[PDB]
Amino acid sequence: TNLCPFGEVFNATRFASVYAWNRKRISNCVADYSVLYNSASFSTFKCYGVSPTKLNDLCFTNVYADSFVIRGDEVRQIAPGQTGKIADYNYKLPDDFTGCVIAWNSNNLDSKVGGNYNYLYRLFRKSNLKPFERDISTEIYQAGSTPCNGVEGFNCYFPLQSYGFQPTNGVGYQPYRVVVLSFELLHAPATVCGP
């Protein structure tokens, strides 16, 4: 039958910025999670609440695949119960997370001579995010009591900021492509199963 189109997610050309991260629903297919572990060399493949060796034996209502790009020293924030700019302001996993996160170094794809300034993250925000929330706002962040009126200045700062992804950067500061697999088990029929 139909194979789950993991090539479209993992092998995409353009990846979303972390603040405007990207969800892809997966349904009506059979996934070979064993092959996914050995499909390549991933620098990270932490599973949560499931063993990927025995994930091929379960069925789920639907599977959500979230993908984006972050720094190397921020991949550790893509885990339950984390803190930091990426976890608090960009992409937040729940404490009861039941899925695997996956990452690999993408200096070959997402860094540029003189600086790649197309990859952005959220710097300022009024509050931390709820799990799986996504804020793509762009309004000037009011830090004082004076209203900003859509104009940058003192105490009026633009909410987003860009990685200066350079090829000669250290691997901690290099771009990494994260892909998070969420598994949902509801009262409905299950359309995504192993072999």
Partner: antibody, heavy 131, light 113 residues
């Protein structure tokens, strides 16, 4: 070698039409936002029009003096950039460049440049519009 | 259109003297999302295609000598050759890539001798 080779210019009567083309080699063409820039003799540079890569929509943009008459297109299977000029005017008399300028700040290519460079221009094809 | 305008039109100094060029945009070309000025400088000699010199306002292209230094921010930019050499006689255009592509009027730099 990465190289841009324009061709297809010369003398054309006003109100007429003419197709410029530019053959590229040495890089992954299909990932670059190519533009045409022209230069009237003794005058400055003037951007004519860009076309984005297929990955980024393929959307075209033209400058006002030529918008409505010019048409840019790709043949990624042959690594060629085209410029269709119709209803030609004498103020279109210029040498026309195909160029990768303006692209590397947006496109998808990474740091592995074949020669450490990203900004490239052809030698240039002159078009004379005259009765 | 965003409109580039350079001053002066021509420039003449002795060998090793300081040459400066100015560029003014209609709107600002500072992108808030990354705090980057989206403009460049090109050099062109007669019969040649232009050569990129500066980008992101100040980032030198590889091979460009240290005499060249881009500066400015927002809508006012300056290109400065610190000690003009005999092989810098050319016309220097400033280009914006903030919205499509637009070139300035160029500035002719000549050697007093």
């Amino acid at each position: 070698e990465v190289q841009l080779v324009e061709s297809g210019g010369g003398l054309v009567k006003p109100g007429g039409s003419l197709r410029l083309s530019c053959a590229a080699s040495g890089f992954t063409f299909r990932d670059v936002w190519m533009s045409w820039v022209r230069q009237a003799p003794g005058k400055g540079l003037e951007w004519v029009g860009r076309i984005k890569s297929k990955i980024d929509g393929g959307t075209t943009d033209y400058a006002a003096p030529v918008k409505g008459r010019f048409t840019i297109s790709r043949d990624d299977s042959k690594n060629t950039l085209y410029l269709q000029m119709n209803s030609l005017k004498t103020e279109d008399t210029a040498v026309y460049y195909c160029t990768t300028a303006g692209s590397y700040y947006y496109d998808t290519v990474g740091p592995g440049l074949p020669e450490g460079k990203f900004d490239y221009w052809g030698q240039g094809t002159l078009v004379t519009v005259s009765s | 259109d965003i409109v580039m305008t350079q001053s002066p039109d021509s420039l003449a100094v002795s060998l090793g003297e300081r040459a400066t060029i100015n560029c003014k945009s209609s709107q600002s070309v500072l992108y808030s999302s990354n705090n980057k000025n989206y403009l460049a400088w090109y050099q062109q000699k007669p019969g040649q295609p232009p050569k990129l010199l500066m980008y992101w306002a100040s980032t030198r292209e590889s091979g460009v000598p240290d005499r060249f230094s881009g500066s400015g921010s927002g809508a006012e930019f300056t290109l400065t050759i610190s000690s003009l050499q005999a092989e810098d006689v050319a016309i220097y255009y400033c280009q914006q890539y903030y919205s499509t592509l637009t070139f300035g009027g160029g500035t002719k730099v000549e050697i007093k001798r």
